[PDB]
Design a protein around this ligand. Structure first.
Ligand SMILES: [Ca+2]
Ligand SMILES: [Ca+2]
Ligand SMILES: [Ca+2]
Ligand SMILES: [Ca+2]
Ligand SMILES: [Ca+2]
Ligand SMILES: [Ca+2]
Ligand SMILES: [Ca+2]
Ligand SMILES: [Ca+2]
Lengths: 401, 120, 401, 120
């Protein structure tokens, strides 16, 4: 195709041309993204023996990520040829895309996450680009994590050696610095006006997702809002429920807590921390297969624990993980018997176990309040969080209006 | 400051908790409307501990303990401490819970409550 | 040759047999070492096209390491042919031998080291199998390093993680733990009987060398004594002088210092520590080319800083480096103005600068003392170790008997 | 105990070192017959430190410090310290030697000998 030819001249070597420069590489990735006939283009490049060449010559990992991601995401019936071509490319130089943030995804797996992700996004309706709504500049205190900030947890500097040490000794002044920032939840809400509350909510939802696979998307990455909508649809929730859960979490999250969240999960300890937007716990992600709707079974099976923890620091994966687990908790409650749950009926007299089976629009406000308890803690053990239900409930008010 | 049950149990109340005397002893819930509040519980009892449980010196005496861990939520896993020291022919028991994201909690408080408890 | 044929059967593929068992490889590495016409065997293997097959088929790094080490040092005429075949077999950046301890040696670099080493031991006289003299079982405290122990620093477990952090934080109690174990040197010597002293000396020298290239030698590795002898001959010292410097080093050395010594040299810091028997500083090994006599100019140039720090933990390379550095220090002293070294002569008045140019047999004892000072510290800056001269002299007397 | 030169300088001797005074002031060498003895030295200087000196906030005031490094022997590299602090019209200088294998030495003892050192 036209795009095939352009790429052939950009990657082809001549007597006076022996490298695919950094700029020709960018021209190549641009040409792939802006192509109207991606499948034909690739078959062409395969026919010419230049498909393999393309993967070997676009060189620095960051560029190989864009290339690999754009081709994984845009190509339907040619995916295999592309994938084979890439495998065949990894001999000699098997480093590929497996550097930096992507250190835990084997290059071939990075391809596969990108392909599945682009499929999911189109099929579930979050492929479309999002206006670049503004993010907070906070770097400390409540609401300074990725929710407020758009700064991805895997992009945060490593915790200094002094601190990692005090953090191993369990020195509380330090465990503070790096744990949940709020104590009195009620007291915190008291400081926010109706407007400040609204502003946060908009800050959270209006941003493009902080994603690790930006180029799996046809254009710019979607708004979080778009992604929450899509996840609400899949799990019979509402995007306002989801946002309330997440805003609650992001209020009780700091930038340092994001750092600790991620780095403790991929360090030797392989910690079972709660990560990302919705504060999903690593083992729970795996145990309940929270990526089911974005990743094929084959791909998920191969995922290391540390890869899963990295995926949770990608906004779309965390949003879907959060939504699916909420629909889990609600479901688990529909099968419960309220008689055997005395303290629960005590704390939320209007609670309605049957209604949980369906949409949150037909839920009593006490179903949200109770689910809030049973999200920050063990689901339906008759042990309730005293302060989280009012805290999630407030955020829900802000989203409902 | 210093609670004295009618069955002999005398414990020191953890600073910052709601004291409330139960049947066999006391029950402390952490003050405030917190997301992840600590729940403590001292009581007296004639029976011995459940058969087989880790030991450890608790100051000048023994302590029979067990730490459970379960799935929780975004706040971490549920940790339940269960601890009993001999008070002569009887036993003082402490129970405790709290969520943690960062592995097993110290339970510093629950232990200082078992350690300082007495009968008479 | 008889040997080429046996090998040819052991590595040949038949119908429905296309793998070389681990048992087959061992018989091949065995058969090679038991060969009396190893040059003819090689040529008879290349004549069949079996020689490239050989290197291709023996795959696990541990066995490839034994096969390559063995052929590199039993060949003369046919050595280049084997090296040719090896390169040919390195198709697609295989691992080869470049795993584990040998991770800082590219496979051609491993072959090229065994070649020079095997040749160096024949030419210099340390090829012959040493008695399996026995090593200490100690794992901490003075005299528990490789000198006492036979346990190579590169086989030592990684330093516990809590500890790594404390070291990075320059924690006194922890640096204490991984540094020199001795404070008052005189005290140490008092608490030893002249018979204890004699046994440390025998244990140091009596053991087979702890070598990274065991199979480069015709049979078992030489004794440290044998290597020390060859090294004293080469630089016009005596093995007693070499021994005394090393024994003093090994007394102020523990297992935990051996681990700190190497791991800090090849961690991200690329540290400038003193490594191995003679406690040679990594940067000093390079600056003064302390392997000149075992490896050729080709091989040496290629060597990464970490390769050098890894060679320093190979007893023969260390002993040769140590001897060379000593002759250096002595040389640098024969070029000196005693009048411009007032502290030096104050402390060692019988010091005879001229005679440092010749053999130690003819040095005044005060020359061994002053050279000790100027081995543990800057050479000839007219600042002295107060303790190290009496400490090395004591080890010297023990060796002189 | 707490040395005090005539020229105004009053320092607190480091445990285990040979107190020995020189014209300008004091000199400290480490007792014992050590392989790698530390060796400080304090003086009351007049002329100010050369321009290039780095800075660290030592105590409540600031310190102008220089740090040399040279090839040593098997005890590691030579490391000479150099630091001065505002002392009225003049300065109180600390001078400290040491070999090291593990990069630059902390100099805890050379800093404590400047933080404490005052003038009459
Ligand atoms: Ca070009
Ligand atoms: Ca949090
Ligand atoms: Ca968390
Ligand atoms: Ca619960
Ligand atoms: Ca076979
Ligand atoms: Ca040492
Ligand atoms: Ca050392
Ligand atoms: Ca010196």
């Amino acid at each position: 195709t036209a795009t095939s030819d352009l790429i052939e001249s950009l990657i082809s070597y001549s007597w006076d041309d022996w490298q695919v420069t950094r700029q020709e590489a960018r021209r190549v990735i641009a040409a792939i993204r802006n192509d109207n006939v991606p499948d034909a283009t690739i078959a062409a490049l395969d026919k010419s023996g230049s498909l393999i060449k393309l993967f070997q010559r676009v060189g620095p990992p960051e560029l190989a990520r864009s290339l690999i991601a754009s081709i994984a995401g845009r190509t339907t019936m040619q995916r295999y040829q592309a994938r084979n071509a890439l495998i065949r490319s990894l001999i000699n130089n098997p480093l590929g895309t497996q550097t930096d943030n992507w250190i835990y995804f084997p290059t071939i797996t990075f391809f596969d996450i990108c392909a599945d992700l682009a499929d999911a996004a189109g099929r579930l309706g979050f492929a479309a680009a999002g206006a670049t709504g503004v993010a907070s500049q906070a770097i400390q205190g409540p609401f300074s994590g990725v929710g407020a900030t758009g700064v991805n947890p895997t992009d945060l500097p490593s915790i200094a050696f002094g601190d990692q040490l005090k953090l191993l000794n369990k020195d509380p002044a330090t465990v503070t610095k790096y744990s949940n920032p709020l104590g009195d939840l009620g007291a915190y809400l008291s400081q926010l006006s109706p407007q400040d509350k609204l502003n946060q909510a908009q800050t959270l939802v209006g941003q493009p997702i902080s994603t690790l696979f930006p180029d799996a998307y046809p254009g710019n990455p979607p708004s979080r809002a778009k992604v929450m909508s899509a996840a609400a649809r899949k799990y019979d929730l509402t995007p306002q429920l989801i946002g309330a859960i997440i805003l609650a979490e992001q209020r009780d999250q700091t930038r340092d807590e994001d750092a600790k969240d991620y780095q403790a999960a991929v360090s030797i300890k392989s910690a079972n921390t709660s990560i990302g937007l919705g504060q999903v716990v690593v083992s729970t992600a795996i145990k309940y297969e929270l990526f089911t709707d974005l990743l094929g079974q084959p791909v998920r099976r191969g995922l290391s624990r540390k890869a899963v923890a990295t995926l949770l620091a990608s906004d779309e994966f965390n949003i879907f993980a959060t939504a699916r687990y909420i629909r889990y908790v609600a479901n688990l409650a529909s099968q419960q018997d309220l008689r055997k749950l005395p303290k629960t009926r005590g704390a939320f007299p209007s609670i309605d176990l049957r209604a949980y089976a369906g949409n949150p629009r037909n839920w009593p406000r006490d179903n949200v309040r109770a689910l809030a308890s049973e999200y920050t803690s063990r689901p339906w053990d008759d042990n309730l969080s005293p302060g989280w239900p009012m805290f999630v409930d407030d955020a829900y008010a802000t989203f409902l209006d | 400051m210093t609670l004295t049950h009618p069955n002999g149990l005398v414990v020191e109340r953890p600073v910052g908790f709601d004291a409330r005397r139960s049947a066999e002893g006391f029950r402390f819930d952490e003050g405030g409307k917190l997301r992840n509040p600590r729940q403590l519980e001292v009581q007296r009892q004639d029976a011995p501990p459940p058969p087989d449980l880790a030991s450890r010196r608790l100051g000048d005496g023994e302590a029979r303990y067990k730490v459970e861990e379960d799935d929780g939520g975004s706040a971490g896993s549920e940790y339940r401490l269960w601890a009993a020291k001999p008070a002569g022919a009887r036993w003082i028991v402490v129970s405790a819970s709290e969520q943690s994201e960062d592995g097993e909690p110290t339970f510093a408080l629950a232990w200082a409550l078992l350690e300082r408890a007495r009968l008479q």
